[PDB]
Amino acid sequence: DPATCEKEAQFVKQELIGQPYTDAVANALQSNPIRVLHPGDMITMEYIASRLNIQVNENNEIISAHCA
Amino acid sequence: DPATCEKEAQFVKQELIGQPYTDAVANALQSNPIRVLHPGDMITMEYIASRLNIQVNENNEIISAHCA
Structure with a gap:
């Protein structure tokens, strides 16, 4: 769903920069x-x-x- | 610089979707x-x-x- 992906990309760019990409992160994402x-x-x-x-x-x- | 990049990527996602990427459009971007x-x-x-x-x-x- 393009709508959820855009929201989630914004959130990553705002709140997750510099942090390890983890299984916790992947599971907290609904995209x-x-x-x-x-x-x-x-x-x-x-x-x-x-x-x-x-x-x-x-x-x-x-x-x-980003979404693509 | 990233500020102008993100602004323009936003302008593009918001106003130019579906439009031909012409020289006039390209020449207007400052990124x-x-x-x-x-x-x-x-x-x-x-x-x-x-x-x-x-x-x-x-x-x-x-x-x-997107900027990247």
Whole structure:
């Protein structure tokens, strides 16, 4: 659901920056699906408005989120 | 800078969805850098808070935007 994903991306970007992406975090998220993006991942550009992307750095710290 | 990026990504998500990404639209954006994401593009993920991504469909119609 694009509506929930956008809300959740906003929340991640506001409240979770710098924290480890954990099973607690994934379970607190109602978006589906969820994809974790890492530095150097090579992916094909698709567009799933309901998909929450959580961007992390090399140490699994959350740095951003967006829906696609 | 990230401030202008997030503002413009918001303007785009809010006002330009479905519109062709024309030179007139592109030239009006002040973000730097700006990257256009086309369907099926293979992208190596590296997060850059200042970069405005304009995602278009196969007809160059805007479907989304995010900073990364």
